[PDB]
Design a protein around this ligand. Structure first.
Ligand SMILES: *[C@@H]1O[C@H](CO)[C@@H](O[C@@H]2O[C@H](CO)[C@@H](O[C@@H]3O[C@H](CO)[C@@H](O)[C@H](O)[C@@H]3O)[C@H](O)[C@H]2NC(C)=O)[C@H](O)[C@H]1NC(C)=O
Ligand SMILES: *[C@@H]1O[C@H](CO)[C@@H](O[C@@H]2O[C@H](CO)[C@@H](O[C@@H]3O[C@H](CO)[C@@H](O)[C@H](O)[C@@H]3O)[C@H](O)[C@H]2NC(C)=O)[C@H](O)[C@H]1NC(C)=O
Ligand SMILES: CC(C)C[C@H](NC(=O)[C@@H](O)[C@H](N)Cc1ccccc1)C(=O)O
Ligand SMILES: CC(C)C[C@H](NC(=O)[C@@H](O)[C@H](N)Cc1ccccc1)C(=O)O
Ligand SMILES: *[C@@H]1O[C@H](CO)[C@@H](O)[C@H](O)[C@H]1NC(C)=O
Ligand SMILES: *[C@@H]1O[C@H](CO)[C@@H](O)[C@H](O)[C@H]1NC(C)=O
Ligand SMILES: *[C@@H]1O[C@H](CO)[C@@H](O)[C@H](O)[C@H]1NC(C)=O
Ligand SMILES: *[C@@H]1O[C@H](CO)[C@@H](O)[C@H](O)[C@H]1NC(C)=O
Ligand SMILES: *[C@@H]1O[C@H](CO)[C@@H](O)[C@H](O)[C@H]1NC(C)=O
Ligand SMILES: *[C@@H]1O[C@H](CO)[C@@H](O)[C@H](O)[C@H]1NC(C)=O
Ligand SMILES: *[C@@H]1O[C@H](CO)[C@@H](O)[C@H](O)[C@H]1NC(C)=O
Ligand SMILES: *[C@@H]1O[C@H](CO)[C@@H](O)[C@H](O)[C@H]1NC(C)=O
Ligand SMILES: [Zn+2]
Ligand SMILES: [Zn+2]
Lengths: 903, 903
């Protein structure tokens, strides 16, 4: 399309800026004659002309307009302005605009109003204003609900749909008189009967604060709720299907929501300004949750909790997701990104601050620690590629909804959180939260870029007379504007340190230039024989300091508790001292640093910076490790080995090794739990237990295989009296299905179809993918695609579980190659992303044959395009090339190591 | 290359014709300095010039010449002829010629001699003069041995290497004095010491009869033998490695060989003319056996037999292969094909006549009957394709060694045998063998084409005043010169019959024209309610006769005992009467016709001539069938269903159905064998038992799974006291490995590596491919390629066993696509063929995705070419296209049928 025309460009003009809107929406929750569920609406937007223009460009997606006064819209003056007549309108589909061509130009610094009347489908597509469905007995319940993030508000009413186009919104919902209407604000006065039809109520809501379009929510349902006024006076309600509320499954959410909201208000010295915060769980929802201001939406598995059937991991998911959503009330809603390229200002903050909130609510769980695994190490895998991207991408590169959706990724979330964790560490949280309070106060009801944050943190540093090697901006720009992270290499003979950009493939091509030269300013903490030393700042590529020199028996480790976003290598002598320490008394090294030593060495090995046997040697001590984290870090790093080797001669010896390493831990838990009758008191110990069972069974410990098959058989014999503790269900179900046959599978499928608890359905859905029978996986694949059997929101998640199974690899890859066009249409756009699927189906690739298929897949589908999976495909090509070389270099030494160390 | 030059054309000129040869060969059975095993030789060929020519074109492959008198060869006169001087010689590699360019022309009807001195590698390539190796303790034994068929005599000495170039051969072998030299004939006088080195003996053999080059054999070994003069005065010796002979493992061969030789000499009224017939078993051999005149070579599994460890199936293999080889002494050696396009004159005859000989030796086994399964139904699968070929291909189409090798296929062997079985049936064997005696007498020491056979059968018909609807030639040309076979469709309402060319795909393109219009002259036998009717000849496309009309309860079946090479369809009413008969008393229908009803209906269903449920309904009675053959025919037809469905939702219900159908038979055998302590007396009942066990275990009968895993465990606990009867070992080993894990696999691999019995090694080698673990199949694939672990002769056989496993499908197909060039070099030419591998890896293909891979595989390797697998690839493309359509048309009805009938 002609790029010279503004209506063919993806960013809105700067010529017009909205002030406020009124919107009336009326969903029809029964099908029409055509069998369509529809909504009808109207809107008036009041806006200011900032520069003279003869066109109104406004977003509109899948809306049909009712003609009024001869055109798609009516344009009126405000405060005496006299707008031109409308010539014609057009709908421009690629850029998603309604374009109003005028017979003259609007006047600079004048206001106007535009009125529209429209209709859209209330589709089951989880996007915009859409329908969710559930059964209560044999009665079909239909719910009208919304998901605007990022660019779907325009699919519900015409609007200037970019996050810096903030406005007040005056919402009216027209709905069946028996159903409750909900929105961001509370109702304004009473609901009144619709004049034309008293079977409907008209419910107007109070005006919203100035806010972004992507945060609006409109819901019509017959949900029930529980409620409690929080200690800061805000009303909290937890809303869900009536049976869930009556069963008490909203009670845990009610226990934690208000207290976390009040905690954040205190911690950041910034009140929550709205009269209420509703939490609502939807049967059909395409994310964990969404932070709509005043009406936070959740999938059921992230909000509801059944103390008798949900696991401790499920409970942890509920409190952390609630905390993340509530964090956004400050970081996202009150203060909002200027544009999506800086998404981490919303998502990095919510991902970090969620742990502070969850830790407040559950102080005995020690959750803050899990950031090392869930954030730092999660994102370092992709951030070690040449095809990663900076935390803050240049704004001019992010234009289309696909490019926007793509940024909701491990960089924006987990690297955002890691960099904030690092910053808080070197500033102290007291100084950090002081700068944040200032940031929030200054930019309340406005939009920010990354520089605005640094300015306010600088203000706090300057007030506290904190001395840093340079300004906050210059330290943090290194971590924000260029991709990747450094490996810091220590020579303990001389006390020298040096840094370089860590790349998993040495022979990979960094094409994105950095004005920072891939050199960082790095805060370095360290310990010497377990005692913390003075902090150090590495400002250059290399330095020397006696802090890093050792003699005699001494060892040093850098990055205490992995507060910093960097990996560490040492000379081989220091590594040997570390390995000696792990054999002598592993408890002398902080638990997070035991995870670090394992995870760093495996990644260093991939990068050819240490021999692979060094990384494998670092797992030897695990035979007597009882802590969750070091085991989890090892299993996560060895996941790569499984992906590379589970179709090869190396796999037997690998499984033999893991069997040996985990057996004493499995036996410890068997004894300590009084033969699986009890679960450990401590949360991390509960997680350690689950990992010991999972690892024991996956790798062939016979006592584990007997245990899980026995428990599952006992359940089959007593379907309504499940004997398996909730914590153990995922792993018992998966391993019992893997060990069993068609009869176990069919039992679990019927339990899934009949499930009344979402946490229970989820565990079964994953377990069913554990079948070793190809014909069963093929049949299951066909079910994942049938929305009457597996909810559309769960289709790609289940397909990923199938491809993770070694027997499902060929099946799913061939399926994806053969069906890309149709798949892309159904689960690749709108509220959906195919990024996770591309990543999962390709991560085993380690052969030229598979690389050629992947290259051909790219070529064959270049025209369809890959939308929000574009970068995942580039990353898959890079990783596959690295994998071919790594397998060639490592397969013999790894086979020999596992063989020689598993006996 | 320039096609105008005779040395660039594949067929020899007709200008020169050999009379006799002397050849001296000296193998060196220890490596030289270069590490090469070599042979050195000399030859003189005496030949007649038939038309004046200035070039001698003679075959030569991988031979290096020692210059003599200034050139590669010396040309001398005979009987006063005066040959021109040699200008120069060249070796032309594609056509495999030594080309001797002369300074003038040879004279028509004059004789000449050409002398050569040469050297070749005694390679481990199983072709020409090659080396075989075995260990006796820690001593490496090296054997020089030969395989000339079809076009490798030229790889041992220069010769006019085409089968109609018959000559006498005077062989001398120079060999270590301690080793025995063997050839076609007996030694001529004593062995004498080599003058230059008395550590070697020189052994000259008597002149051969006039014979073809592909039948020559030269062997040097320290084998031992057992011997017996046969009743026709011919000396028989069975030669093998000393340990096998001492163990008595040559004894069964000695029991059967002479008696079968004498039987054939009597039956065909034609003496075997040579003084001896040696049978020799080689450790390295690329076929079942080879019929060299006077020195028949065998792989060990086809000649040796251990009564304490070989199965009844193994014993049947030995007698039938010996019988096949001995049949060739008449059909192939005494009388020889003019050219390879008429190969069935050798191979069709040996494949049919083998049963007559084996039945003579083992009259209680009823083997002749197995022709229906092993010949008729084996070949009808490929002969129903548009890409099949006639029994007698036009001679001008068969030129290269690849094209020749390709003809050693189910058409030349099994269709050849089926057509001869049909001919014998309509003539009577008395009249058949009378015409054959005449054929053999007339063409002894000469070469024939298919017309020569008809002429001699006609002579017998005319002598006996047999009346046929036309001449033997005109009846049999229909079965010989066009591909395929008819389906005869009966309308029992009206007594009408009609025929059409049977094509598995209706939408497949027959491109090879037939001067016979794909119309046959068909001898039709029939039964009515079990009573045989008068015979009928269908000479036209349609006819009417009251023989084929029924009324009331009567049924008719055509093709009693399937003597004729045709399929039969009926109107649905007659089919229903047949199905009623099978429910009432299945024994009222001859056993071979129970197999026919099943096999025909399944093939008819594929061809869209009956509904698939009709073919499935024909298997219902199997629940009370105890006979081997109908079960085997059903399992063979349902193999297709397994290939189409074992990666689909249909597979569960299919296995459930087979489980139901086989359980009573399995329980019958469990009881009748006194819990597997005994085996049945009757051979077919022994085979029925094995099939019941195999089918029960494959489809999940729990008593079977427990039985096999129990027996295998008992063996592991007592390795030197195997508790599994030899008949049961293949199926017990495979199913125990499938049910087990790494420990069962490793035990069987060590048993394989340590095997001293070839029959035992073979069963283990197949069983190891039954692992359900992808990593284990991948590791095993790597072993198949290592000649130190699996003998080169067994590499592709083992790869085929892996691809037959559903879990091995993707593995092997991806391997074949990725490694075609190297694979083609190693196992695709010379004595090797890749035809079986192409057929096996592609037979599951039923998707557009797989078709596209196959088409791309063809394109990608068009330049490498596909040699003797060319037609198998064309057939795979045709079948894959048919399979995609068949699965689409049948998957729902088949799923429903198996589901509704398995309960
Ligand atoms: C959404 O609802 C809000 C709140 O009711 C509306 O804001 C109100 O708008 C009216 C009319 O513009 C304001 O009164 C006027 O103020 C202007 C100054 O701009 C003055 O010149 C006029 O004489 C008149 O008094 C009123 O103050 C304002 N209320 C608040 C609390 O801001 C808003 O107009 C609605 N937007 C739409 C598109 O319906
Ligand atoms: C292979 O060995 C055979 C058998 O020893 C050789 O056949 C013999 O060849 C000689 C010499 O040609 C024959 O004698 C001659 O016969 C011709 C008639 O063609 C006559 O004109 C001469 O006066 C002379 O007597 C001899 O009959 C023949 N023996 C037999 C049994 O056929 C043959 O030559 C050898 N071939 C080679 C290439 O060494
Ligand atoms: C627990 C949280 C991860 C839940 C919630 N998640 C999200 O907002 C993302 O998953 C987004 N739903 C991802 C996305 C954006 C645009 C188009 C398609 C998909 C959030 O608050 O960030
Ligand atoms: C029991 C018999 C099948 C044994 C024996 N078989 C054969 O001769 C064939 O298998 C041939 N060995 C096939 C062949 C021919 C040319 C090049 C490569 C392979 C035979 O006598 O026909
Ligand atoms: C919008 O109009 C299109 C084109 O006529 C029609 O197909 C579609 O159903 C309409 N949408 C609704 C919700 O009525
Ligand atoms: C919520 O808190 C109440 C009161 O402390 C407690 O009894 C209940 O167990 C809590 N619910 C959950 C799910 O922890
Ligand atoms: C810094 O101190 C000034 C002067 O007291 C105060 O007004 C401001 O709020 C402080 N800023 C921060 C970020 O603490
Ligand atoms: C791993 O440990 C083994 C055994 O102690 C040792 O021989 C080897 O050197 C270690 N690997 C490295 C890279 O240090
Ligand atoms: C034949 O000559 C070629 C070319 O010199 C040589 O490489 C090969 O080894 C020779 N073959 C034998 C058996 O000596
Ligand atoms: C060969 O025949 C002898 C004598 O009849 C018999 O004892 C022996 O069992 C036979 N060998 C085999 C393997 O059948
Ligand atoms: C046919 O009969 C003639 C005359 O007796 C006889 O010479 C010839 O051998 C016979 N041919 C056949 C094929 O039986
Ligand atoms: C197969 O048998 C079923 C059940 O008797 C019958 O309903 C069906 O018609 C049969 N199929 C055919 C093709 O006759
Ligand atoms: Zn978020
Ligand atoms: Zn043969």
């Amino acid at each position: 399309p002609d790029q010279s025309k503004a209506w063919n460009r993806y960013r809105l003009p700067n010529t017009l800026k909205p002030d406020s809107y009124r919107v009336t929406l009326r969903p029809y929750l029964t099908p029409n004659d055509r069998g369509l569920y529809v909504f009808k609406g109207s809107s008036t937007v009041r806006f200011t002309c900032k520069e003279a223009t003869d066109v109104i460009i406004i977003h509109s997606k899948k809306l049909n307009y009712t003609l009024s006064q001869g055109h798609r819209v009516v344009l009126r003056g405000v405060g005496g302005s006299q707008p031109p007549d409308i010539d014609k309108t057009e709908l421009v589909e690629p850029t998603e605009y309604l374009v109003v061509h005028l017979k003259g130009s609007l006047v600079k610094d004048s206001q106007y109003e535009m009125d529209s009347e429209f209709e859209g489908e209330l589709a089951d597509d989880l996007a915009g204003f859409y329908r969710s469905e559930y059964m209560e007995g044999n009665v079909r319940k239909v719910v009208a609900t919304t998901q605007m993030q990022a660019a779907d508000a325009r699919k519900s009413f015409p609007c200037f749909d970019e996050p810096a186009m903030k406005a007040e919104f005056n919402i009216t919902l027209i709905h069946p008189k028996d159903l409750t209407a909900l929105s961001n604000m509370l109702p304004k006065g009473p609901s009144t009967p619709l004049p034309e039809d008293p079977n409907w109520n008209v419910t107007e809501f109070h005006t919203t604060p100035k806010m972004s379009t992507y945060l609006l929510a409109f819901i019509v349902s017959e949900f029930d709720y529980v409620e409690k006024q929080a200690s800061n006076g805000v009303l909290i309600r937890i809303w869900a299907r009536p049976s869930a509320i009556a069963a008490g499954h909203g009670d845990y959410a009610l226990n934690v929501t208000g207290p976390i909201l009040n905690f954040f208000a205190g911690h950041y010295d910034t009140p929550y300004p709205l009269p209420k915060s509703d939490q609502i769980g939807l049967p059909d929802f395409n994310a964990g949750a969404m932070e709509n201001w005043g009406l936070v939406t959740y999938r059921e598995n992230s909000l509801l909790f059944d103390p008798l059937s949900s696991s401790s991991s499920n409970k942890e998911r509920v409190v952390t997701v609630i905390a993340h959503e509530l964090a956004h009330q400050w970081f996202g809603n009150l203060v909002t990104i200027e544009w999506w390229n800086d998404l981490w200002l919303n998502e990095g903050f919510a991902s970090y601050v969620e742990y502070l909130g969850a830790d407040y609510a559950e102080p005995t769980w020690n959750l803050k620690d899990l950031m090392v695994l869930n954030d730092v190490y999660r994102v370092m895998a992709v951030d070690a590629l040449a095809s990663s991207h900076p935390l803050s991408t240049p704004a001019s590169e992010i234009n289309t909804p696909a490019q926007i959706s793509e940024l909701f990724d491990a960089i924006s979330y987990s690297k955002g959180a890691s960099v904030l964790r690092m910053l808080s560490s070197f500033l102290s949280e007291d100084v950090f939260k002081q700068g944040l309070a200032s940031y929030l106060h200054t930019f309340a009801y406005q939009n920010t870029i990354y520089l605005n944050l640094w300015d306010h943190l600088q203000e706090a540093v300057n007030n506290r007379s904190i001395q840093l090697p340079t300004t906050v901006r210059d330290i943090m720009n290194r971590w924000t504007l260029q991709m990747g992270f450094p490996v810091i290499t220590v020579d303990t003979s001389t006390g020298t340190l040096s840094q370089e950009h860590f790349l998993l493939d040495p022979d990979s091509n960094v094409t994105r230039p950095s004005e920072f030269n891939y050199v960082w300013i790095v805060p370095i903490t360290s310990i010497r024989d377990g005692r913390q030393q003075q902090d150090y700042w590495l400002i250059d590529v290399r330095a020397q300091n006696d802090l890093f020199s050792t003699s005699g028996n001494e060892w040093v480790l850098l990055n205490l508790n992995v507060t910093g976003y960097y990996r560490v290598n040492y000379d081989e002598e220091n590594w040997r001292k570390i390995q000696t320490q792990l054999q002598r008394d592993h408890s002398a090294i902080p638990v997070i640093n035991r995870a670090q030593i394992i995870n760093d060495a495996f990644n260093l090995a991939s990068a050819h910076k240490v021999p692979v046997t060094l990384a494998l040697n670092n797992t030897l001590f695990l035979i007597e490790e009882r802590q969750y984290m070091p085991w989890e870090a090892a299993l996560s790093s060895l996941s790569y080995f499984k992906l590379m080797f589970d179709r090869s001669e190396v796999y037997g010896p690998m499984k033999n090794y893991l069997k040996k390493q985990v057996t004493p831990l499995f036996i410890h838990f068997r004894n300590n739990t009084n033969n699986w009758r009890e679960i450990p008191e401590n949360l991390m110990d509960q997680y350690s237990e689950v990992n010991a069972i999972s690892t024991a069974c996956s790798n062939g410990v016979p006592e584990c295989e007997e245990m899980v098959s026995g428990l599952f058989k006992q359940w089959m014999e007593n379907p309504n009296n499940n004997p398996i503790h909730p914590n153990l269900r995922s792993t018992v179900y998966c391993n019992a299905i893997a060990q069993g046959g068609e009869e176990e599978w069919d039992f679990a499928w019927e339990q899934f179809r009949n499930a009344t608890l979402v946490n229970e359905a989820d565990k079964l859905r994953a377990a069913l993918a554990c079948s070793k029978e190809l014909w069963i996986l093929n049949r299951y694949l066909s079910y994942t695609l049938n929305p009457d059997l597996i909810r559309k929101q769960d289709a790609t998640s289940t397909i990923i579980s199938i491809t993770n199974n070694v027997i499902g690899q060929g099946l799913v890859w061939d399926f994806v190659q053969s069906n890309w066009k149709k798949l892309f249409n159904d689960y690749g756009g709108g509220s959906f992303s195919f990024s996770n699927l591309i990543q999962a189906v390709t991560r085993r690739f380690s052969t030229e044959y598979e690389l050629q298929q992947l290259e051909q897949f790219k070529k064959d589908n270049e025209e369809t395009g890959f939308g929000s999976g574009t970068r995942a495909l580039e990353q898959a090509l890079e990783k596959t090339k690295a994998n071919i070389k790594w397998v060639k270099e490592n397969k013999e030494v790894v086979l020999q190591w596992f063989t020689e160390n598993s006996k």
